[PDB]
Structures are given as structure tokens and as C-alpha cells.
Design goal:
heterodimer; A: little secondary structure; B: mainly beta; SH3 type barrels; 5-stranded antiparallel β-sheet; globular; Mitogen-activated protein kinase kinase kinase kinase 1 (chain A); GRB2-related adaptor protein 2 (chain B); signaling protein regulator; SH3 domain-complex
Chain lengths: ~15, ~55
């Protein structure tokens, strides 16, 4: 049922 | 990838994030970052989880 996790916010920067 | 459909609601929690509701269609501007894609909705720009959308193609 539950949606997946959001990835770490630090990965918004380049190079994931 | 030019267009993707939201699979889940995403709540923007940072200034650079693009929130959306499930089923909304996002214009995809960058899909090279594997974690966070850059896109547009409501003429608004932001980053959102790649895993929260399904590319339309």
C-alpha cells in the first residue's frame, strides 16, 4: 500500500 | 525523457523541490540524475524523485 521512500535530499546535487 | 506521469503524491519539503499529486503529468527537463529529476508543473520548476514517476513513451 505505502508509497516508496524519497531518496536522500543530498542526491539532488550532481553525481547523485 | 520529455514527459512522465506521477505514480504517487510527492510533497515538496525544500525550496528546489516540485510537488505533485498522483496522476499529474510532469515536463521532464533533466533525467540524467538517477535519484532526482528536474521538471516543470504549473509553470513551476523543481526537483522530484525519479522513482515517483513513470516516463511516458
Amino acid at each position: 500500500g505505502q508509497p516508496p521512500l524519497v531518496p536522500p535530499r543530498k542526491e539532488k546535487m550532481r553525481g547523485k | 525523457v520529455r514527459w512522465a506521469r506521477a505514480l504517487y503524491d510527492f510533497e515538496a519539503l525544500e525550496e528546489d523541490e516540485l510537488g505533485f499529486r498522483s496522476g499529474e503529468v510532469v515536463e521532464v527537463l533533466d533525467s540524467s540524475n538517477p535519484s532526482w529529476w528536474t521538471g516543470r508543473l504549473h509553470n513551476k520548476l523543481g526537483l522530484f524523485p525519479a522513482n515517483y514517476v513513470a516516463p511516458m513513451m
